[PDB]
Design a protein around this ligand. Structure first.
Ligand SMILES: COc1ccc(C(=O)NCc2cccc(C(=O)Nc3nc4c(s3)CN(C)CC4)c2)cc1OC
Ligand SMILES: COc1ccc(C(=O)NCc2cccc(C(=O)Nc3nc4c(s3)CN(C)CC4)c2)cc1OC
Lengths: 352, 384
């Protein structure tokens, strides 16, 4: 550990996209500091005042040069969540079409929990898997966190099940794609915890890709509303497979296995699954098995596809697209330092 | 477009951005502040990673301190050797506590830039600038010949030597003026000598950038009581408008002291010196005996007058054209290439014979009960 060796080691940390002290993450620190200090009450402090005087125009210049919401033309809102929305966007300069997820910093600060997105960021950006929705850019302003992802024109599997009477042949395909998709997540050292058809999106070819990773959690050393498993409602990766069985049941029956008009009713039905759980014999066998060993099950035995070439085969529903923007498959001032921008330092990612 | 992240003169350069995070971790890591969930969780995420950064980056521990070779108001200068490269340097330390306590924690910026980007043989080179929660560190080139105060005390300086050192100061100050600065504290303590015995200016802590008409507006008197000019000495709110001629006054003070052995406005009482500078018309007297020539007396008097009639007012060429500098040994354009009057006898790369010994004695910031940001005036100081 003697420089220029430790100088090279320092230079690697500034260039690495996976690094928390990366050039883009360091700019976030100064950007957040300027946002959180620029108030008349705080400017009474000579240290705060003079720091802001020096990094005044230069941070405004940085804000102009860096990626912002103004660089994207919003076509239409294609999704909504608890803390934000997903909009179909087109980059004004490149004319490239994307899906932009927005997360309200106000809501993340108000009702606490402002760390859920860190899992979603690392998964979507560093997966490099055909089973995960790719994150091209991540940026932020004083109000929102923005996630520029690849657009999925095929829509979600909730929309597919509502528009089609799903046969067992189709059910075999989509379940198998989810199995391969979840295995990639586990291989990355993560557990989904919210496997559902709303989080299963289809591309232009009609193939599955997992989304909404705001419920994920990184595994330790060894690996430790109806879709929830009894263990969650210390555990391994086997908890996500329960939700696969829930998904397979709903796909073939048309209703969730533990449905109740009262949410508390579903909770009691999940805990009593042994007496609560009420097509073919092998499909029923798989649902009950969840309620390589998954891949070896008789339900997946077919003459159309193979596990290693499944994504290369023709999907059951290939979306009819007219354009690159086709959406037919979609329906206080502080009196002292508070540091509201601090939980969001290091969110900015660009790739290449 | 990322020119702002690569440029060493940029305030948003990679090293300056790290300072922001480093300062934030220092200023937020207190139990009272950690009660805030935003501050607590930010510090939890950038915990180990900032400690890793602190280990990888340049620190005081990378340098082996040989001995203290200088002392200032806000710090000290120590002869150091880099532990890894074994390279010998002079490290200036500036107390963040003293800068915050006494206010005025912005003097070092122009000093950092002048030493770093002058690229002149007349200016002491700054190789590295770094910091911790307590000090600002300035890794500079070591000047083994010492200061001109030490030279005048150890030698009975003749006029031939006086002609050389005055001429080197003239060329040195002209370079600082060409960079758009007024020194404001020209004295022999700030005049250092290299291994060859040639002059280099140091301590640019009083330096101020001139406007397009070479002027400066300052409401506070700056410099040393013996070397200060009348225009700078009497500066106050409303009346503090002066040019580069104030540096030339100090040259005349330096030339007088070199030949006489005493400052021209010396007094045992400091206010006596103040009075003597303001009354320079009747105060400037040469010792009765006389041996210091007619042209040397002419130069001292040409500098030691009111600004409007002071030599140098019409540029540096009128100073260079003075009869005192007329000699048969050197020329203005080749002066630094000629052999110096005193070439230091050096036994080792860590020879401190030309520096006197210094004695010993710190204070720290109280724990904050709310955010104070004591590290904020020092963000961006890190260089190379
Ligand atoms: C490229 O295609 C897409 C990729 C992902 C998504 C997606 O993600 N949708 C759900 C969503 C959207 C917006 C906000 C939130 C949200 O607030 N999600 C939240 N999750 C948690 C919150 S708020 C608070 N906390 C209790 C922990 C978990 C969720 C949509 C897409 O388009 C179809
Ligand atoms: C290459 O070798 C050397 C290079 C530079 C120096 C040097 O520079 N010495 C003066 C000095 C040293 C330490 C601190 C300060 C200081 O506190 N300087 C200060 N300047 C100002 C302050 S405190 C506050 N304010 C009154 C206005 C400007 C001054 C010495 C060297 O060799 C011995």
């Amino acid at each position: 550990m003697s420089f220029e060796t430790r100088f090279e080691k320092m230079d690697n940390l500034l260039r690495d996209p996976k690094s928390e002290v990366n050039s883009d993450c360091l700019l976030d620190g100064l950007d957040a500091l300027v946002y959180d200090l620029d108030f008349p009450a705080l400017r009474k402090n000579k240290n705060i005042d003079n720091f802001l005087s020096r990094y005044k125009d230069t941070i405004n210049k940085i804000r102009d040069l860096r990626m912002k919401a103004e660089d994207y033309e919003v076509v239409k809102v294609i999704g909504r969540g608890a803390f934000g929305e997903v909009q179909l966007v087109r980059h004004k300069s490149t004319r490239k079409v994307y899906a932009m997820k927005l997360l309200s910093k106000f809501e993340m600060i108000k009702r606490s929990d402002s760390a859920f997105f860190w899992e979603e960021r690392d998964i979507m950006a560093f997966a490099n898997s055909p089973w995960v929705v790719q994150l091209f850019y991540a940026f932020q302003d004083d109000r929102y966190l923005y996630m520029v992802m690849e657009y999925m024109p095929g829509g979600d599997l909730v929309n597919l099940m509502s528009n089609y009477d799903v046969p067992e042949k189709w059910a075999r395909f989509y379940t198998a794609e989810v199995v391969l998709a979840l295995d990639a997540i586990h291989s990355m050292g993560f557990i989904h915890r919210d496997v559902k058809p709303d989080n299963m999106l289809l591309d232009k070819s009609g193939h599955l890709k997992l989304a909404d990773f705001g419920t994920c959690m990184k595994m330790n050393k060894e690996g430790m509303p109806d879709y929830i498993s009894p263990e969650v409602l210390y555990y391994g990766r086997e908890c996500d497979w329960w939700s696969v069985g829930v998904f397979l049941y709903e796909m073939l029956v048309g209703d969730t296995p533990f449905y109740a008009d009262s949410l508390v009713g579903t909770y009691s039905k999940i805990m009593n699954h042994k007496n609560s759980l009420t097509i073919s014999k092998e499909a029923k066998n798989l649902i009950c098995a969840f309620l390589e060993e998954i891949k070896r099950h008789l339900f997946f035995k077919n003459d159309q596809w193979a596990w290693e070439t499944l994504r290369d085969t023709v999907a059951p529903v290939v979306p009819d697209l007219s354009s690159d923007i086709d959406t037919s498959n979609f329906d206080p001032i502080p009196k002292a330092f508070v540091g509201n921008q601090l939980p969001f330092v290091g969110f900015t990612y660009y790739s290449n």
